[PDB]
Amino acid sequence: ASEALTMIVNLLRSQEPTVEQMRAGLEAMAQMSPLPADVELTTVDAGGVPGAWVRVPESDPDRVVLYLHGGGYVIGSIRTHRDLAQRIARAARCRVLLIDYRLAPEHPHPAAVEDSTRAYRWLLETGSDPKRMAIAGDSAGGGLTVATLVALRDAGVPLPAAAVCLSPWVDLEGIGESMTTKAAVDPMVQREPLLRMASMYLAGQDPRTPLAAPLYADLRGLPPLLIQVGTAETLLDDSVRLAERARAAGVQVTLEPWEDMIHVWQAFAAMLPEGQQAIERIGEFLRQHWQ
Ligand SMILES: O=C(O)c1ccccc1C1c2ccc(O)cc2Oc2cc(O)ccc21
Ligand SMILES: O=C(O)c1ccccc1C1c2ccc(O)cc2Oc2cc(O)ccc21
C-alpha cells in the first residue's frame, strides 16, 4: 500500500476510556478535518431525528444519500462524519443527509433503527424518489444500513436504488475468523472494545437479534449493495459473511476487499490516496445505480 498508510497507522497506534471520553475524543479528532469552503451544511429536523444536509457545487439536488455514521452505536455525530459525507456528495454528485440517530447506552437497540427508518420515511414524505436515493454507512452505520433496509422492506416502504457499507459491523459477538487472524494487523478494532459497545447497544437483548446483527436478518429483496472492506481488518469476515448472506438471498452484491486497508480507511482520504480512490468508487457505484 501507499507510504501514507504508515502515517495513519502511527496516529492510530497512540491510543479503558469512558463513553463521554470516547465521544469527546472522536469530536476532537474531527476538528482536524478542515470543511472545504464550497460545502453547504443545513441543519434540519428529519421527521423527529436531528439531521444535516451536506451539498457541494456539483450535487444533483434530486439525488440523496442517507448517511449513517459509525461509532459502535455509542459514539459519533453529524460533525464527526461530515468530511466523509461531503467527499461522498462530491464523488456521487448528490446531496447527503447525515442523521444524529439515538446512541447507546442512553438509547439502546432498536432506537438507532427507529431513527434511520424515520429519516428515510421523512425523505419520501418531503418528495425524495427512491430511484434517486441510497443508504450508506460505516462500521456500526454499515450494519445500521442493512438493518434499515430490512425494516423498511418489512413495513412495505419502497427501497432505495442502492446501498453502501464501509467496513460494516454485522456480528455483535465477534466470532468471525478475521477477529482472531487479523487482530495482529488491525490498529483500530479489537474484539474487546467491540463487545463493550455491543453490550451497550443490546442492553441484554440477544446478540443475534436480526435488526441489531443483520448477519441473522432476512436480506431477500434488498437493492444492489457495495461492501468496501480492508484486508487488515478484524471486521473483514463481517463483510465476507454479509456478502455470502446477501448473495444467497438473491441481492446483487459487490464485495471490494482493499488489500492492506484498515477500518474505514475512506475517513483518512485527505492524506490516504486509497481513501480518496475508495470514495471515487462509491461515487461511481451510486451514479451507476441512479442511471
Ligand atoms: O471544530 C470546530 O468547528 C470548532 C471551532 C471552534 C471551536 C470549537 C470547535 C469544536 C471542537 C473543538 C475541539 C474539540 O475537542 C472538539 C470540538 O467539537 C466540536 C463539536 C461541535 O459540534 C462543534 C464544534 C466543535
Ligand atoms: O473486553 C471485553 O471483552 C469487554 C466486553 C464487554 C464490556 C467490556 C469489555 C472490556 C473492555 C472494553 C474496551 C477496553 O478498552 C477495555 C476493556 O477492558 C476490559 C477488561 C476486562 O478485564 C474485561 C472486559 C473489558
Residue 161 belongs to domain with CATH number: 3.40.50.1820
Ligand 2: residue whose CA is nearest its atom 2: 192
192 alpha carbon – ligand 2 mean position (Å) = 5
Query: Which residue has 474484539 as its cell numbers?
Result: 191
**Strands of 40-45's sheet in order across:** 40-45, 50-55, 94-99, 60-68, 133-138, 162-166, 225-230, 253-258
Q: Is the peptide bond before 214 cis (omega within 30 degrees of 0)?
A: no
- Residue 63, Ramachandran bin (φ over 0: left; ψ between -120 and 50: alpha; else beta): beta
Report the structure determination method.
X-ray
Contacts of 177 (CB under 8 A, 6+ apart): 237
74 alpha carbon – ligand 2 mean position (Å) = 15
Sign of CA dihedral 281, 157, 95, 83: negative
The rounded distance, in Å, linking the Cα atoms of 10 and 31 is 19
Ligand 1: residue whose CA is nearest its atom 13: 28
The answer to whether 286 touches 94, Cβ cutoff 8 Å, is yes
Residue 230 belongs to domain spanning: 3-290
What's the structural domain count of the chain?
Answer: 1
27 is catalytic: no
Ligand 2 pocket, Cβ-based, cut-off 6 angstroms = 16, 192-193, 195-196, 199
Task: Enter the resolution in angstroms.
Answer: 2.0
Comparing C-alpha atoms, which of 24, 211, 203, 210 is closest to residue 104? 203
| Atom of ligand 2 minimally distant from the CA of 195 | 5
81 is catalytic: no
The rounded distance, in Å, linking the Cα atoms of 223 and 205 is 28
Residue among 194, 195, 200 to mutate when testing ligand 2 (max atoms within 8 A of CB): 195
Question: Which ligand number lies closest to the CA of residue 179?
Answer: 2
30 alpha carbon – ligand 1 mean position (Å) = 8
- Residue 264, Ramachandran bin (φ over 0: left; ψ between -120 and 50: alpha; else beta): left
Which amino acid appears at position 120 of this protein? Y
233 is catalytic: yes
Residue among 20, 22, 27 to mutate when testing ligand 1 (max atoms within 8 A of CB): 27
Contacts of 153 (CB under 8 A, 6+ apart): 159, 221, 222
Question: Which ligand number lies closest to the CA of residue 174?
Answer: 2
Ligand 2: residue whose CA is nearest its atom 16: 16
Catalytic option among 33, 263, 274, 289: 263
Residue among 16, 190, 196, 197 to mutate when testing ligand 2 (max atoms within 8 A of CB): 196
Contacts of 287 (CB under 8 A, 6+ apart): 92, 93
